[PDB]
Amino acid sequence: HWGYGKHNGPEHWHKDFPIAKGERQSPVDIDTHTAKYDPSLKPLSVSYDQATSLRILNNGHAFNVEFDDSQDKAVLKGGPLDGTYRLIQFHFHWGSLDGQGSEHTVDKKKYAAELHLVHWNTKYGDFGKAVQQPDGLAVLGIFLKVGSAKPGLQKVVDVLDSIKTKGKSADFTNFDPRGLLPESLDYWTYPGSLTTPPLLECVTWIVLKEPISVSSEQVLKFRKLNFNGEGEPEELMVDNWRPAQPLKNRQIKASFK
Ligand SMILES: COc1ccc(N(C(=O)CCl)[C@H](C(=O)NCCc2ccc(S(N)(=O)=O)cc2)c2cccs2)cc1Cl
């Protein structure tokens, strides 16, 4: 099955998922001198005060922090979006070394990691229906650079020992995702895809300009996770990122001058 190795990594995915070579694939390079300020973009609304986290799961690719999405409790609205998008999960992509790990790049710069807060359009009723629509998902992407610790990340770091291997989960209640955001909500936006199989072209991407800082100790703990199951040979969960895909007939819009 698919992964990030030499034998099952991003250059192989097109054989099982031919949309890998499609017209609106993600991630992409954000060329800051080509992206155009769009004064018609509305302010982004991130409403996470009633977020109900549930669980954290090692899925063999990354780890997901899952939320209750049965009501409008943590939602993303405004910006380029029409309607209301419910938070279902967040996860990260990261590298083996601090000079790689992000999926999006900025003027070809790679960040140490990238956080994806995944939301689905409530007009489609559930997540499985939303991924079949061109406007089904909105993913908020936040870059991570290594520097000072991110206090709001530490509860995540401290449970990773308990979900080391594929298929392990742990209770993860009362986690506040607001602690993962930078100060500014300035962003770039473009139409794209899931960055993993099944690579469906269902995402409005919203990528924040301001990175968050995390500590060397925090990212080191990400890199101690395993892709393998318990009782299988250890393979460190590192370099779980897809590289930049062709932009094709797409415009990246900036929310800021
Ligand atoms: C609250 O209820 C839940 C929350 C999550 C789940 N899911 C899980 O896999 C369990 Cl963690 C999945 C899930 O989160 N799949 C992710 C597919 C995806 C790939 C890539 C990207 S990227 N890199 O941002 O482009 C985003 C999204 C699913 C959601 C619905 C059915 S299966 C399940 C429940 Cl019912």
Ligand SMILES: [Zn+2]
């Ligand atoms: Zn992702």
